[PDB]
Structure 1
Amino acid sequence: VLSPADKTNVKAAWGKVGAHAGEYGAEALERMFLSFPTTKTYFPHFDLSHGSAQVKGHGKKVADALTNAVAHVDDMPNALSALSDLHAHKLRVAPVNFKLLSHCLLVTLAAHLPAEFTPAVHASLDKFLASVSTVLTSKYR
Structure 2
Amino acid sequence: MHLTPEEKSAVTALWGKVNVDEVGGEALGRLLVVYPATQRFFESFGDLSTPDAVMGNPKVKAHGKKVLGAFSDGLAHLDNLKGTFATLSELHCDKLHVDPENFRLLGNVLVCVLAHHFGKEFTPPVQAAYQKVVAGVANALAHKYH
Match of 2:102 in 1: 97
- Of residues 49-58 and 64-73 in structure 1, the stretch that sits farther from structure 2 once superposed is 49-58
1:77 Cα offset (Å)? 1.3
Distance 2:126 2:25 in 1: 22
1:113 Cα offset (Å)? 0.4
Distance 1:31 1:70 in 2: 22
Is this contact kept in 2: 1:29–1:55, CA < 8 A? yes
The 5-angstrom pairing of residues 1-141 of structure 1 reads 1-17=2-18, 20-47=19-46, 48=48, 49=53, 50-141=55-146
Distance 2:91 2:10 in 1: 29
TM (norm. structure 1) is 0.93
Is this contact kept in 2: 1:80–1:135, CA < 8 A? yes
Larger RCO, structures 1/2 (Cα 8 Å, 6+ apart): 1
Can you give the 5+ residue segments of structure 2 that lack an aligned partner in the other structure? none
Is this contact kept in 2: 1:89–1:139, CA < 8 A? no
**Matched residues, percent identical?**
43
1:82 Cα offset (Å)? 1.4
Is this contact kept in 1: 2:28–2:61, CA < 8 A? no
- Runs of 4+ in structure 1 deviating by more than 3 angstroms, as ranges, are none
Distance 1:95 1:42 in 2: 13
Distance 2:80 2:104 in 1: 21
Can you give the 5+ residue segments of structure 1 that lack an aligned partner in the other structure? none
